[PDB]
Amino acid sequence: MNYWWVSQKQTFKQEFEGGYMWSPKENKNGTQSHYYNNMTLVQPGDVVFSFANGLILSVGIARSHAYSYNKPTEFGVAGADWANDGWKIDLEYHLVENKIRPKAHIDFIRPYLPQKYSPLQDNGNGNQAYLFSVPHELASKVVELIGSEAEEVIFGFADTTEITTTADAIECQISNDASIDETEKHQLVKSRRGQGIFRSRLEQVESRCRVTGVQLKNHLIASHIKPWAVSNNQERLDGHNGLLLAPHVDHLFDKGFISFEDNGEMIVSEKLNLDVLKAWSISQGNYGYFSKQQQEYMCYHRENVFKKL
Amino acid sequence: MNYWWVSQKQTFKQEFEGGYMWSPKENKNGTQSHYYNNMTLVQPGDVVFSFANGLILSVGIARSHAYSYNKPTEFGVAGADWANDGWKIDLEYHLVENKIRPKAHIDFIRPYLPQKYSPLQDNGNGNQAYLFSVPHELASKVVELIGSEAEEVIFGFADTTEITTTADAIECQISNDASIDETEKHQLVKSRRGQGIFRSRLEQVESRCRVTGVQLKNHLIASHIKPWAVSNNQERLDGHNGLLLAPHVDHLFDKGFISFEDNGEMIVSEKLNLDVLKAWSISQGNYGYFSKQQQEYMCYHRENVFKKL
DNA sequence: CCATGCGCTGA
DNA sequence: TCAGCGCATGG
DNA sequence: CCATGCGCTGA
DNA sequence: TCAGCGCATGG
Ligand SMILES: [Cl-]
């Protein structure tokens, strides 16, 4: 997941109200702009900090790659200088109550500014350009300053969108892969959504939500332990590579907010606000023993899915 | 959603272990069979009752339309009579502890048996054929007899698969509609998953899971009130046509297990096992008041989504 | 009238 | 269990 | 050296 | 507000 700084002082209202980022393709003499170029490197699920009148107003999630769009008519005078031919990105705006003025924290920030294409000068004054790369180290500091409601937008949200993208790719490769017969194809694709032979088999091994106790099949999700995306065709359909979970536990476990030791002990990530568990009346503690086959898979989960610091 | 009866006395082990239904295409002399024909009318998410040794052993969900497949080699002698060229369906088997003997309920059932292609004779003896249509009125009686753990497989599970299918259709028609520009297309498609400008807007109106109290954006789902599927392009992107919900509340509300009055009072469906709410520590009662625009949408939900009997 | 078919019955 | 007896369906 | 640009300043 | 004044970047 990549981070971005978007200086929007001229047109922030229009871009937030429109739920978009927009720039020209080139500068007004036809020449290449690294800033406008950056538009084409923005991935769905990449975080974008909106900066205007010296303040960070939005922690944004990008919901598109840059697509060829003409200047917004609602820009008026404020964007008369910009070429009509432009890049547009759909940005999931998230307003933040705590709008940090970066300049006022420059002492903390400056060391994490990149040497070239910094959004800020060394005095902490914004550079005159539209879009800059934000190195993850700098990103982590901006986030620290804005506090909770920046972490809220990233962890188990924005940083899940690229995972989803990687899984979609794999689902297309399966559906065009001759090497696996039409039944395997069908049962692999269905196993992803927790359907087909995988679900049947899981129910043979487990009978209820390990955490909540619910046994009713219509209120349980057939989540994998080792995620579908990284599992071989054997493990994608293995009943032992699965847990029946209530949707909110599936949520917490799928994203690695909680995991389990081999002994059943719940492990809670530092990234999970304990308030969540209190609000959903979920206790820490032992949720029963795992089979040897299960413990193999639950280990991969701890080391690869479960969010560490 | 269509229901089906599949008589599997000869090959049930093989078909359940394989997570499939299979029949020949035709009878021994190339002649047409309405029963084998029925294979091609089976829709994903259609419910299929497995009948063997006079008992219903499975309430199945179909995970495929019928596809051209040769006889399973594991049938051996037991299926030597059947042509090799056959139909195959992927069946999500769900075993039931309460295995009803339909014959023993025949006096109650008989009137709801169809005139032609009944799976049962009037004495309640199974007919010698593989697959029969089950009309919804007869279906409702079988379900009544098997009790909860048939309802488990159907309500908010099997009957959601066909909804998903209808929604996918709509998402493809949007993406091929010349009349709506590339931004509308993108924001309608993303609004479905609770993403893009719809999410931004919803956050303007609502700030927390109405039920659980969770305020953290990474543990909240942007569910619509009036479902995406039947909302006009205005309502698909309306912030007032939405609720921020914890995943397990999104689950219960999106499928109509719970709804709300205009006053905030939770309404619990007859189809929701109250055990669920106790296990997830959710109380009935008032979950705060709705805006007038919200009350319009919440009403449609009560009458169209919220499961009544 | 005859043929075919994933049920049905245990001498 | 393996055969024989049905009934429902269709040529 | 010259050109360009979603910040910044103040009348 | 919007012209004019910077710095950052590149031809
Ligand atoms: Cl109102």
Numbering used by the authors:
A (entry chain B), B (entry chain A): 1 to 309
Question: What are the paper's exact sentences on this?
Answer:
Except for the weaker diffracting crystals of VcaM4I with dsDNA, the resolution of the data reached around 1.5 Å. VcaM4I detects the modification by flipping of the modified residue and accommodating it in the dedicated pocket, as most clearly demonstrated by the structure of its complex with dsDNA. The ssDNA and dsDNA molecules in the crystals are bound to the N-terminal domains. The faces of the nucleobase stack against Y130 on one side and W82 (plus to a lesser extent P24) on the other. The Watson–Crick edge of the base (i.e. the edge that would be involved in base pairing if the base was not flipped) is engaged in extensive hydrogen bonding interactions. Its exocylic O2 and endocylic N3 atoms accept hydrogen bonds from the main chain amide of Q10 and hydroxyl group of T11, and the N4 atom donates hydrogen bonds to the main chain carbonyl of W22 and the Oϵ of E15. In the DNA stack, Q128 fills, at least in part, the space normally taken by the flipped base. The DNA binding site of the C-terminal HNH domains is consistently empty in all structures. While the DNA could be well accommodated in VcaM4I HNH domain binding groove, it could not be modelled in the structure of the full-length enzyme due to severe steric clashes with the inter-domain linker regions and the EVE domains. These findings suggest that all crystal structures of VcaM4I in this work show catalytically inactive conformations, which are auto-inhibited by steric conflict.
